[PDB]
A paper describes a structure:
Here, we crystallized and determined four additional structures from the CVB3, rhinovirus B14 (RVB14), and rhinovirus C15 (RVC15) REPLRs using a Fab-assisted RNA crystallography approach. Consistent with the CVB3–DLmut and CVB3–BLmut, the two RVC15 REPLR structures, RVC15–DLmut and RVC15–BLmut, were very similar (RMSD = 0.972 Å for the superposition of the common cores without sB and sD loops). Interestingly, with U41 being flipped out in the RVC15 REPLR, our CVB3, RVB14 and RVC15 REPLR crystal structures all essentially contain an sC triloop. Yet, the last adenosine within the sC loop (A40, A35, A38, in the CVB3, RVB14 and RVC15 crystallization constructs, respectively) is absolutely conserved across all enteroviral REPLRs. Notably, in all structures of these REPLRs, the modeling of the sB-loop was ambiguous due to the poor electron density map in the region, which suggests that the sB-loop with the highest crystallographic B-factors is more dynamic compared to the other areas within the enteroviral REPLR structures, indicating that stabilization of the sB-loop may be influenced by PCBP2 binding.
Enteroviruses contain conserved RNA structures at the extreme 5′ end of their genomes that recruit essential proteins 3CD and PCBP2 to promote genome replication. Previously, the phylogenetic and biochemical probing analyses have proposed that the domain I (called replication-linked RNA, REPLR hereafter) folds into a cloverleaf-like RNA secondary structure with a base-stem, sA, and three stem-loops, sB, sC and sD. Here, we determined the crystal structures of the coxsackievirus B3 and rhinoviruses B14 and C15 REPLRs at 1.54, 2.2 and 2.54 Å resolution, revealing a highly conserved H-type four-way junction fold with co-axially stacked sA-sD and sB-sC helices that are stabilized by a long-range A•C•U base-triple.
Residue numbers in the entry:
A (entry chain H): 3 to 230
B (entry chain L): 1 to 215
The structure:
RNA sequence: GGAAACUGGGUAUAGGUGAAACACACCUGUACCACCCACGUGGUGUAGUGCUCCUGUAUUGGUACACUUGCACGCCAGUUUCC
């Protein structure tokens, strides 16, 4: 689209920390509309956070962030901001930026939304995943129904991206939602179902990229040793 | 006070071509300051209805919105496959704003018993002092399933997490990875590691299992 | 600056409109209150001029000098145009 909102500056913050978010607009001027921040914690629903009303500068805050956040705007740079202070892990969410429409056309609805940027409040150190093979069973099946994958353990922050044979393999692949384990690191695994007849030749490689820490790993995933 | 938006059902299982209705009741009067959003995984929301019942431009006409007093109903006159998603509701009658908690909408199909798979830990991992034992439940439907870890026929508890895939785009099924985490020290102390699964497509629970250090 | 249009007692408040939830601007209602009269279903910038009309002071019908009503300019303040 021509009209765009582009958040940036969300990232990793340890508790009690201080991030500032930028929402930068294109194709419209923010000074003639009202700008909103709306957050969404993982697997959770949406949460209005704060907004700013045009021509007045009037700010408004949801009760759960009163005192800690500040919303501000800059016409010179066509950008809204969200200063965050006194952060805590409850605040871990994707922070979307949105705009109210024009009253005559879209009421008070929010017609244009940024991509959302991710804040992770956590004392964890940026860390690369470790990748281990989920090998196919020695029993598997005499007919071609076999299951394999990779375990992607102990990384921080989110997200990772996993592919099979560098995108070659897509059918039958499930990559499950990561799980925040009690050490504060993330872990998920990825699987795929392939014919058992293919195991003795076809070489399967999971492709793991954890961007936050400059980490790509590939693991070949073989049948168990002595499984002939 | 803060106005509350109370949105039933919080999920819903229907087929292509059904009429559906999400409801969203208000703790106070919001006149007509209601809006409905559609969100799909990994993606921002999209506006569907603004003020009472007015249909934001480009949104198809199977989407309508209505109003009785403080009770508002989004309605879809027959679902198309591109319509299964979560739907929210917003009041902007006064600040702070308030979003409903969503109504995930999902595709009704017939029951799919899971295909059960168990994975030991990599010996590479055991070099790090930890074991992870993974259990795969593959392409099952409906979503509810039971995964119990018995270790030398001792039932485990609170040493295992899990996660579920979104409903599959092709065959509309679910899948699940249960992860038993042990210390290497405790892992090595036992032999028969098992995964026992209960589901509606299972006339009796399915156990997949192995022995630590067979081939 | 030049000219072009309107507008005009107070406080509230409902609605509209301005790219507009509040604020600010404008517009339209409502309620109430403060003041003028010749007292109304009235009026409302103005210690200004002119015509007017009411009420006096009276004097030399005439005349001053006030009071009042309306009208028309002007002046003041605000707004909107357009250079």
């Amino acid at each position: 689209s021509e009209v765009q909102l582009v958040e940036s500056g969300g990232g990793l913050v340890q508790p009690g920390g201080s991030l500032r978010l930028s929402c930068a607009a294109s194709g419209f001027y923010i000074s003639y509309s009202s700008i909103h921040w709306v957050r969404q914690a993982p697997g959770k629903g949406l949460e209005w956070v704060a907004s700013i009303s045009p021509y007045s500068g009037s700010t408004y805050y949801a009760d759960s962030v009163k005192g800690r956040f500040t919303i501000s705007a800059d016409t010179s740079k066509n950008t809204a901001y969200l200063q965050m202070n006194s952060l805590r892990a409850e605040d871990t969410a994707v922070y979307y930026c949105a705009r109210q429409g024009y009253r005559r056309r879209s009421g008070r609805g929010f017609d244009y939304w940024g991509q959302g940027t991710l804040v992770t409040v956590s004392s964890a150190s940026t860390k690369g995943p470790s990748v281990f093979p989920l090998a196919p069973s020695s029993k598997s099946t005499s007919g071609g129904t076999a299951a394999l994958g990779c375990l992607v353990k102990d990384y921080f922050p989110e997200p990772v991206t996993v592919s099979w044979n560098s995108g070659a393999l897509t059918s039958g692949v499930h990559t499950f939602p990561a799980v925040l384990q009690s050490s504060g690191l993330y872990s998920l695994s990825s699987v795929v179902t392939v014919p058992s007849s293919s195991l003795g030749t076809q070489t399967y490689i999971c492709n793991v990229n954890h961007k936050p820490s400059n980490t790509k790993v590939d693991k070949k995933v073989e049948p168990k040793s002595c499984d002939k | 006070s803060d106005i509350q938006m109370t949105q039933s059902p919080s999920s819903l299982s229907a087929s292509v071509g059904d009429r559906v209705t999400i409801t969203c009741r208000a703790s106070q009067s919001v006149s007509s300051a209601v809006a409905w959003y559609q969100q799909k995984p990994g993606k921002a929301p999209k506006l569907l209805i603004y003020s009472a019942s007015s249909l934001y431009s480009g949104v198809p006409s199977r989407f309508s919105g209505s109003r009785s007093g403080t009770d508002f109903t989004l309605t879809i006159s027959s679902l198309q496959p591109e319509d299964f998603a979560t739907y929210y509701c917003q009041q902007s009658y006064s600040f702070p704003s308030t979003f409903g908690q969503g109504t995930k909408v999902e595709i009704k199909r017939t029951v799919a018993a899971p295909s059960v798979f168990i994975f030991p830990p990599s010996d590479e991992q055991l070099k790090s002092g930890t074991a992870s034992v993974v259990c795969l439940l593959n392409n099952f439907y409906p979503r509810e399933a039971k995964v119990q870890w018995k270790v030398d026929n001792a039932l485990q508890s609170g040493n295992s997490q899990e996660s579920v895939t979104e409903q599959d785009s092709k065959d509309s099924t679910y899948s699940l990875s249960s992860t038993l985490t042990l210390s290497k020290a405790d892992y090595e102390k036992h032999k028969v590691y098992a995964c026992e699964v209960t589901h509606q497509g299972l006339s009796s629970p399915v156990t997949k299992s192995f022995n630590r250090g067979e081939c």
